[PDB]
Amino acid sequence: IDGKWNCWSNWSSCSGRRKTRQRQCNNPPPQNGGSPCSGPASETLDCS
Amino acid sequence: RECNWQRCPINCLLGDFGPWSDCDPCIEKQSKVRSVLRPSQFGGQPCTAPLVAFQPCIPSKLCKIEEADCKNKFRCDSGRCIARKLECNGENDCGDNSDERDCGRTKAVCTRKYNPIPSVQLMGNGFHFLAGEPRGEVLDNSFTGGICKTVKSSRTSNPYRVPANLENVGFEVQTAEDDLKTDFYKDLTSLGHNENQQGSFSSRSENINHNSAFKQAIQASHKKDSSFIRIHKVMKVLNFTTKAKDLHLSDVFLKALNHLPLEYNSALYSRIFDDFGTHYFTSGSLGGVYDLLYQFSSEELKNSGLTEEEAKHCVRIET
Amino acid sequence: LAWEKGSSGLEEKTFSEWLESVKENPAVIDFELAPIVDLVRNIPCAVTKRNNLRKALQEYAAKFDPCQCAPCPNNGRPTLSGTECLCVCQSGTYGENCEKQSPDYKSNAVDGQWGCWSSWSTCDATYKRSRTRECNNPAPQRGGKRCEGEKRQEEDCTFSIMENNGQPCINDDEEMKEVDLPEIEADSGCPQ
Amino acid sequence: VTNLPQVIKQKLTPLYELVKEVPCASVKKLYLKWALEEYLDEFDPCHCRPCQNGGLATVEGTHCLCHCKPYTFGAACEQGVLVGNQAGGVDGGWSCWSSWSPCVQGKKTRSRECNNPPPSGGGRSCVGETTESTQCEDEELEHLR
Amino acid sequence: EVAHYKLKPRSLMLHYEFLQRVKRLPLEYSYGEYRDLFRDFGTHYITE
Amino acid sequence: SSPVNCQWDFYAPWSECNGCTKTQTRRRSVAVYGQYGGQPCVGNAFETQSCEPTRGCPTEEGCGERFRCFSGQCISKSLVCNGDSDCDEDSADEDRCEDSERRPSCDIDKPPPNIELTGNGYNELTGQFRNRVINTKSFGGQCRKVFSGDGKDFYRLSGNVLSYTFQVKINNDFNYEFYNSTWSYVKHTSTEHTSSSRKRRSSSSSSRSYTSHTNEIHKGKSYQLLVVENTVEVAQFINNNPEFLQLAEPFWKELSHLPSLYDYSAYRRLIDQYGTHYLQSGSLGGE
Ligand SMILES: *[C@@H]1O[C@H](CO)[C@@H](O)[C@H](O)[C@H]1NC(C)=O
Ligand SMILES: *[C@@H]1O[C@H](CO)[C@@H](O)[C@H](O)[C@@H]1O
Ligand SMILES: *[C@@H]1O[C@H](CO)[C@@H](O)[C@H](O)[C@@H]1O
After folding, report:
1. From B27, E24, F173, F220, which residue has the greatest number of CB atoms within 10 Å?
2. Contact F41, F34 (CB under 8 A)
3. SS (HEC) of B87-113
4. Is the four-CA dihedral F260, F264, F269, F271 of positive or negative sign?
5. Which residue of D has its CA nearest to F230?
6. What angle do CA E6, E7, E13 make, to 5 degrees?
């Protein structure tokens, strides 16, 4: 099985803002899958 | 064996930029030069910081370049004065068509389609003598001269037309440098040994006996065959001479030469040599080359070997 | 023909079909050169732009003469694009700048080639400057051979005399006009 | 191929040399230069801690990628085996310039010192110059204005 | 790879069916009418 | 090696305030580049805010004595109704001319088969070609023609090309390298006994063989081939220097949209579309 995340959490508050992702059903380890990932497992930015 | 055979990379060095030259009116620029302290070679970092600079600049004199009146020669719309004979020529001697654009019945266009001499525009390129490569299109070697003179390559060939920049061309077939060199090295070894041995010994009543023996045979070899073949052929299918006088310069060359400032500028007149090259072919072998090096190595090794050994040790006792 | 591996030596079928195709599109294999700046006759200010263009070729050579390249391996001629040197190779030498040899070519070792001129030695006591070059790219050591073309130059110590003030426009045909017809003369006045 | 070519070998001029017959072209030429210099300052592979096994880095936008050598693979080119002749060791490669020193006598300076894992195992020294010095920008500020 | 396309950066001339949904978008914000433009005409335009 | 996630720098100090847009852009350059399978910097390499400029928007200027196309590029009046498309994209020089006023510019319309690639831009650091920079086909009302000795055809050349040559070269290099190996081996041993004893009546007897054998084989083979080959059909194609190159309409539009104040974000947009360099000369051929 090849991995992909759930939908990412929309944002946290302003003054520094964060988005987060999980693979709970999706994950490779069941029946010995392939790559889990293609980008950043967590994400954050300035508000402006 | 060799490794890093290719020699140590010289990285480029350039001097400090000079002054901004006396500001050139007609180009409306001033040029800042720099020189080379060592070129790049064997793969070193190029002169990647660009080798020349131009600054936009206010003039400080009028431009003094003339217009050409050219004594009844025909001024084409891009400014070339072609020969008066070519007015209403037919074909197109200006490139611009200005020679023919509005006319009555033209002068005689040739009695047929004729192809030009093969690769003939190479005879009209320039050569950068410092860099060992072509530059420019110095002559328009598709200029027809308003005439239908022709050369035949073979009975099987179509006829070919001579552009007016060439004093003569010959078709031939030649080999003019011819080289075949070949080497063979062959080496064989055959080695072997084979052997046998035997022996036996002997010595209440008590008695003892012994026997032993051996055998071997072996054969081995190495072989090498390595062979080389270099063939270099220089073949000279065309030979040519470009005229001594009145050569027809290419549109794109005749443009740049007019554009150059009348007052000197090192960078502006220098780009003519990057663009058009340093020298042109007055005569030359429009030929073919084949160069071929075939190197071969073959090497081989073999073995066979056999052995046996035996021993026996016996005793009797009685009373 | 270029695809042919060559183990047989030349396959005359392919070599002849290629050679017939060479009649149909050649390449320049050897050549005899005249300098670009001799050509030009059409342009306005021809003579002036010509003078300047010789003069630029002198400076261009002083800057880009491949004598300044490090010694070429295996007796190639050094050649310089402007920003990199590459060596032009001899038959039996190859690689990017001639670093390696066919097994026959190793026998030559003749090795006769120049390094750059020194700057000008100032006037020789008959007012002529001069300069010399020293055969000093990788020297004629194991074999022996002269570098080609005269080792030294002599050049009159010429310099400028007058306030520079730009340049005049000059064209080849004009100067021999000892006589020309009386002008349209609209400022009527009188002739002599 | 004679009827459908591609470009095979190239000699280059910097793009900024083209800017002509637009408003402020005089200035735009220098600004496209400084922007190209700054583009190169983003893009130069010096930002990338070098690929192993002779692979050359390149900058993706805000990111590094590797042009690996054949049948050696992965993001750093660590996995697999090379093919063809090999020199051994690790040939040296630069980390990015220390940002230009303030002007003296009309010239800046900058220094790069091969601070990534050094030329090692007999590998050749980093290909380039440790230090550069360049004339300052004050002629744009005074003249083009 | 026997053609390469690049679209101009701007000064573009629109297909009239797109242009007419764009002239039908509200200046007020309410996501559903804007959603139909992405359904009918895509999220991004192909530039190279 | 450990995966490197990207890090943003702190922002630059905005910009000179843009006279046309009435905005300012601040750069967010890179402190650490992502490497080794680690993340690129999430979000935007720039941001932009409104700003009241002391800077003017530059006006933009037409052609005077020269004709003007719909884009704003300028072209000689001697190229109006020349019947070529002299205006690069919109051919306003060919709008509503009379067939009595029209004339032939040349016998043919066909260029050398990919002259287009000669006018492309070039990104040195990705190594790739970039979009149309030089107009490769400003014929310029001229009938500069060449017979190609390869593909056997006549072609038309532009005044933008310094030289289109029609030389051929093909250079081939082959390396083929081969190994093969094989082995076989045998070993044997035996160790043996007998004894017999009789006493008076009673007797006993015995015998033995320990015996053993081993063999092995191996083989290994490898074969490695390289070919590199080049073809050319024009070998110096030379583009002119910038004094005589005529530019592509959208590239020249971008040069007009470039802000004339130093917005780094604005100047990147040309560099990403058109690269770092133009091809000044080269070989058009094959590999
Ligand atoms: C050209 O080579 C031929 C041999 O093909 C020779 O006969 C001819 O005179 C040479 N042409 C000239 C005049 O260079
Ligand atoms: C949520 O946020 C980013 C936006 O930058 C998405 O692209 C991604 O799906 C992440 O999980
Ligand atoms: C960004 O902010 C800096 C603060 O130093 C200003 O100097 C600059 O004008 C820009 O607005």
Report:
1. B27
2. yes
3. CCCCCCCCCCCCCCCCCCCCCCCCCCC
4. positive
5. D8
6. 160
Distance, CA of B216 to CA of B308 (rounded, Å): 6
CA distance F75 to B311: 109
Contact list in E for residue F254 (CB cut-off 8 A) is 9
Residue C162 burial class via C-beta count within 10 angstroms: exposed 0-12, middle 13-18, buried 19 and up? exposed
Q: Cβ contact (<8 Å) for F163 and B135?
A: yes
- Strand ranges (E), B236-278: 238-242
In Å, how far are B51, B53, B210, C53, D136 from B31, measured between CA atoms?
Answer: 11, 6, 107, 17, 16
Task: Give the ranges where F161-223 is alpha helix by DSSP (H).
Answer: none
Return the residue matching tokens 């140590």. B8
Coil, helix or strand at residue D119: coil
Is F160 exposed, middle or buried (CB count within 10 Å of its CB: 0-12, 13-18, 19+)?
buried
Give which of C146, F142, D120, F280 is closest to B275, Cα–Cα: F280
- Assess whether the C-beta atom of B173 lies below 6 angstroms from ligand 1: no
Residue D122 corresponds to which tokens in the numbers above?
Answer: 């007999």
Which ligand is closest in space to the CA of residue B170?
1
Atom 7 of ligand 2: nearest residue by CA position: A8
Nearest Cα neighbor of F1 from B86, D29, A3, D64 is: D64
Q: Choose the residue to mutate in F14, F26, F48, F262 for probing ligand 3, maximizing ligand atoms within 8 Å of C-beta.
A: F14
Give the number of the ligand closest to the Cα of residue C32. 1
Inter-residue contact C84 to C78 (CB < 8 Å): no
The count of other CB atoms within 10 Å of the CB of residue F56 is 10
Q: Which helix (H) or strand (E) holds B215?
A: strand B205-235
**How many Å lie between the centroid of ligand 3 and the Cα of residue F267?**
19
Closest protein CA for atom 11 of ligand 3: F14
3-state secondary structure of D25: helix
Experimental determination approach used: cryo-EM
Residue tagged 């017939």 (tokens): C20
| C87 CA → ligand 3 middle, Å | 53
